[model samples]
Target chain A: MAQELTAMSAWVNQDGSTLYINSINAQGELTGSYINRAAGAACQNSPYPVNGWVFGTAISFSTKWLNSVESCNSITSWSGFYINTGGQGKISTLWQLVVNGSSSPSQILKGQDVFSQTS
Target chain B: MAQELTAMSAWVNQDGSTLYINSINAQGELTGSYINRAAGAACQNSPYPVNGWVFGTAISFSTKWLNSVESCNSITSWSGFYINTGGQGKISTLWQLVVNGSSSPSQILKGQDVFSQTS
Candidate 1:
């Protein structure tokens, strides 16, 4: 069986996005909602579906820009770990944003986002 | 540009496998070799191709058990970070093994492996 997200409910990314972990099943599959707070963006302040896998304290997940008004037509994925540093639990991640299924270098955005656990 | 693996060459997982990071491009796309050291396995001691992405110190890669004799017909992926602890460089990861394209709870194996750097 896989680990569950029973203790943690939300995480705020460095970019100001909040990830709300809804559930994790026995298959290690996770479902959640990501509220993007980017200013002047089409999906600003909107929640999107997030899906990924969690193995112990390691996690990888993505949220697609679809099923919403003025979608960004992109998929963003994050991979990293959930760890405790100085008694503060954090989810440090590296994320990649792929736009319109393009693998072209210019179309992809890659960077780091550390999510601090929130109540 | 993505961070390159110029200083490190190989890492040994806790599962006894050796992961050789061959190359990482400007797009953060990585290619490498993975030698499974599982005892008595069909592809024991054989090297497989690994493909994944790296963002700064964060990484995620996978190898498929195909194009080889007695292939296991499964894919294994690892996601984690590259960190230095006590002056020792390490890759701490969470891994998942998926067999036959099935998301069946019983067919998925999830675990953790801390990889130590080697020359």
Candidate 2:
């Protein structure tokens, strides 16, 4: 029997600087959405100091580059970050994304499968 | 600092009994995408009780078996009915398939993790 669930969505800001969104049903199964929206920015330059963010409402977060950006195209591979929210605080998990076009969108962390930290 | 998100997609229902896609950013993430795809009707039935389905959107239900009435010759390992959805759901999650053989593909659940039922 399929349980009733809600859906939520998230996207990067227009400046290619921030990723934000309200809380709704991510469509998946989990209930909270945690994200390190800055991963993209971190990867774009340097030591990539590991930063993180948490969703306040539901569980889930996705990403999309601006329609004009042309840096990460055809990203066949991706790097993941740890996630933590909902009381669990920290755990282990990986975040993956596809760089299809200039807007290479990646799947956000939603559901309980995601962790705040990965070892 | 990034905030602002929204993207969604779902699939299913050509009249193949059940199997639906919902939510969004399934693009790629460990957040949630556990699916059993009926393991091809328990490999075509014979004391196949691994029967497990969830998601309300067919969390990981992908098949064209009913589209043309063809049997499943390609479907990885899938057998379990464990999913909590929210409130932490279950635990240990492992549901991956890519049976491009038929509707041959799968992924599901929402966030925080999935498993009400998986050993």
Candidate 3:
């Protein structure tokens, strides 16, 4: 049967950078957008990481960099995270965002994947 | 809001190994069950890998092995795949199941994630 991996998950760090993954599954891939609502001033220019996507071409973990990037010439990955709010409907995540390569303005943003509504 | 990443996707390899992910979500996680239906007799004792749970503690990719395991002492990860059946509602996946450790009578069963109804 065909199902949708579409859902919205929000989270933050102690410094108050927020993440809003308001997306739906088109086929089996995570397509839509997420808001990196960071309160940090250093990310003022890049906090709005849009045209967001989640890929499963990811296989394992590495200390080098996350492996969840797409084919848009982006090396930034969304590993360090998955959700397991199963029986209790609650989640605890260890999320990370490492902007790498010579393309991005660069920074490694980290946070958790929890439940939330708007803003 | 809280939506569900609960859906079904099925796929196979060129060798006729079948995978049935018959699962549903209770909360925001990927819960329920999936059948690692394999035609290969090498996995006689391990084909019925159940109590199936998908975790998100995954953080990167590796040439070593998949990093998607659970607290149940499971080191078997389900990376190498996601769904991209958005516009055409079709999907293609790169799934690998390297059942590791002395606990499992192991084998690395590989397959793809596509659409299916039953056996």
Best by lDDT: 1
Across A25-113, the per-residue lDDT of candidate 1 in tens digits comes to 66455668889886666787778766665655666666666544556756566666666666666666666565543322344566677
Candidate 3 Cα errors over 4 Å, as ranges: A1-5, A8-14, A37-41, A45-47, A50-76, A80-91, A96-119, B1-119
State candidate 3's DockQ.
0.04
Q: Write the per-residue lDDT of candidate 2 for residues B1-119, one digit (tens) a residue.
A: 11111112211112121211223234322121222333334323221111122221122221211112333332222211222234322222222222221210123212222223221
**Better model by lDDT: candidate 1 vs candidate 3:** 1
- The parts of candidate 2 lying over 4 Å away from their true place are A1-21, A26-60, A68-71, A74-92, A101-119, B1-36, B40-119
User: lDDT tens digits, residues B9-64, model 1?
Assistant: 68887768888988876645566888888666667787886656565566666666
Q: Candidates 1 and 3: which is better by DockQ?
A: 3
Q: Which candidate order results from sorting by lDDT in descending order?
A: 1, 3, 2
- Candidate 3 per-residue C-alpha lDDT over A1-119 given as tens digits, one digit per residue, 9 for 90 to 100: 11112355454434444444455345222322333334543322223332222323121121222124422211222222233333322222333343322212123344334432223
- Sorted into a CAPRI-style docking class, model 1 comes out as incorrect
User: Backbone collision count in every prediction?
Assistant: 0, 52, 15
Looking at model 1, the pairs that clash are none
Off by over 4 Å in 1: A1-119, B1-8, B101-103
Ranking by TM-score: 1, 3, 2
Over all chains combined, what TM-score does candidate 3 have?
0.28
Query: Model 2's CAPRI class?
Result: incorrect
Per-residue lDDT of model 2, residues A1-119, tens digit only: 11111233222222232222233322212222222334444334221111122222222222322123223321111111222344332222222333221111123222222223221
